[PDB]
């Protein structure tokens, strides 16, 4: 069995590298922004024996700014470097945002009569939709167990992008879209709330001032899903949550009381979000109630008939 596994493992690693190399070669040959003279040179060195991950990264993936394949390379190489990983995530998000904005612009010109730039093939997804498509494609290929998904660093960055680029209600997007994304991808509920707590305590920009209203809304949505999950898992077994989650919702209520007060005394006139915040207060209290009941004994009596 040992000799079998060692060969199955060598073939699995070399197959992972080979697919990366094939994805690169195909993309480079098809890229409009690559001169023909270079493409023939790329085809010579990549359509043959499998190359090392260093070369694939330095000589090709990094030169062409294929940041998604850079991340797959950091995964195949067991690359321990959080800072470079996050730099690559930041470049991939920004590159995709600019590409989505460009395609929506070209569209708006068609729907208005103008002419596109020469050699531009004529309702493309909003930028936050194309961005999260990129995150999904990588996650399914790396399985979320990778070091290219440090949720403690990657979730705040994605939330930062949503704020600093208005990927919120103004354009008709769900303001909780970053949370939906990572939950559906299979991030455990406890880890989400744990990170969101750290976002709220440290107050790193842009998560500052009255925009912590949005952080509280994410916490509300995450805890809500967590409660639903626990209730579902209890019914499941008929046929972890600590007091820290309750404390976190209390502080969240205090943040909302602070934001509303500051909003009422702003220069130029009171803030327009008065009832929007009053609603969030009710939701947060409802969640603290549910969490308090579960913590107080209703969680050990979930498999029992009522």
């Amino acid at each position: 069995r040992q000799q079998q596994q060692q060969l199955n493992h060598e073939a699995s690693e070399l197959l992972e590298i080979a697919h990366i190399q094939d994805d690169l070669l195909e993309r480079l040959v098809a890229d409009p922004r690559i001169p023909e003279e270079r493409k023939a040179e790329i085809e010579e060195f990549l359509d043959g024996p499998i190359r090392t991950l260093t070369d694939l990264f330095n000589d090709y993936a990094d030169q062409a700014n294929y940041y998604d394949l850079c991340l797959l390379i950091f995964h195949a190489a067991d690359f321990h470097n959080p800072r470079t990983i996050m730099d690559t995530w930041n470049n991939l998000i920004n590159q995709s945002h600019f590409e989505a904005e460009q395609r929506r612009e070209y569209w708006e010109i068609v729907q208005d009569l103008p002419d596109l730039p020469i050699a531009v093939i004529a309702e493309p997804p909003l930028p936050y939709v194309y961005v999260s498509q990129q995150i999904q494609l990588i996650a399914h290929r790396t399985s979320l167990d990778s070091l290219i998904f440090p949720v403690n660093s990657l979730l705040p960055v994605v939330c930062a992008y949503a704020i600093n680029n208005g990927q919120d209600a103004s354009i008709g997007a769900d303001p909780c879209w970053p949370i939906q994304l990572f939950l559906n991808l299979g991030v455990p509920h406890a880890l989400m709330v744990q990170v969101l707590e750290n976002v709220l305590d440290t107050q790193e920009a842009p998560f500052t001032g009255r925009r912590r209203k949005l952080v509280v809304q994410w916490i509300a949505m995450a805890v809500d899903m967590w409660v639903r999950e626990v209730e579902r898992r209890a019914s499941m077994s008929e046929a972890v949550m600590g007091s820290w989650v309750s404390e976190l919702l209390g502080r969240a209520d205090q943040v909302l009381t602070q934001i509303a007060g500051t909003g009422a005394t702003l220069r130029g006139g009171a803030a327009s979000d008065a009832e929007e915040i009053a609603s969030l207060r009710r939701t947060v209290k409802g969640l603290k109630r549910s969490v308090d009941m579960l913590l107080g004994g209703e969680m050990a009596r979930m498999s029992f008939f009522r």
Binding site: I34, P35, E37, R38, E41, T52, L53, T54, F57, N58, D59, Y60, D62, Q63, A64, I73, F74, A77, F79, T84
Partner: peptide, 17 residues
């Protein structure tokens, strides 16, 4: 085994020779 070396590469956007 990966080793990044931004120093000396080959200009991916320039022909050879």
């Amino acid at each position: 085994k990966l080793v990044i070396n931004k120093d000396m590469r080959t200009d991916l956007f320039s022909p050879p020779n």
